[PDB]
């Protein structure tokens, strides 16, 4: 697998739209047909690791991030690996990372976003 995580440009502090895009996740593979993806943080807010909280570097304030509603609906399956839920998607595909839930008022800051991606056959 080859993965890219690309930030969305033009993001502004203040009230953002519901499900405002913030990053794109690209996953490609010449061998594997599918991939699982989970968010990585100290505060994962749902059972599949597809919604989680990220803290700002300079302010320490939290935003809610996760896979978009539309991205979630493209899932092939949910698997269980060592007990942990992993939603799977077709390789050679892009997914949207968004601000989750209702409109968020976002403080101006840098916010690190980390994901685990795994190949599946």
């Amino acid at each position: 697998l080859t993965v890219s995580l690309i930030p969305v440009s033009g993001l502004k502090a203040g009230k953002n739209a519901p499900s405002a895009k913030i990053a794109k996740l690209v996953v490609n593979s010449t061998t594997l047909k599918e991939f699982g993806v989970r968010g990585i943080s100290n505060n994962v807010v749902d059972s599949t690791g597809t919604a989680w909280r990220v803290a700002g570097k300079n302010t320490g304030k939290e935003i809610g991030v996760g896979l978009s509603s539309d991205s979630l609906r493209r899932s092939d399956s949910t698997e269980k690996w060592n007990g942990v839920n992993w939603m799977t998607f077709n390789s050679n595909d892009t997914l949207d990372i968004v601000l989750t839930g209702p409109a968020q008022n976002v403080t101006a800051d840098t916010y690190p976003i980390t994901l685990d991606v795994v190949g599946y056959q």
């Binding site: 993001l11 502004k12 990053a23 403080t107």
Partner: peptide
């Protein structure tokens, strides 16, 4: 396929 696993990270910037 655990040997194809990877952690990927980026900074997202909200400007004033």
């Amino acid at each position: 396929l655990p040997n194809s696993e990877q952690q990927k990270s980026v900074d997202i910037v909200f400007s004033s």
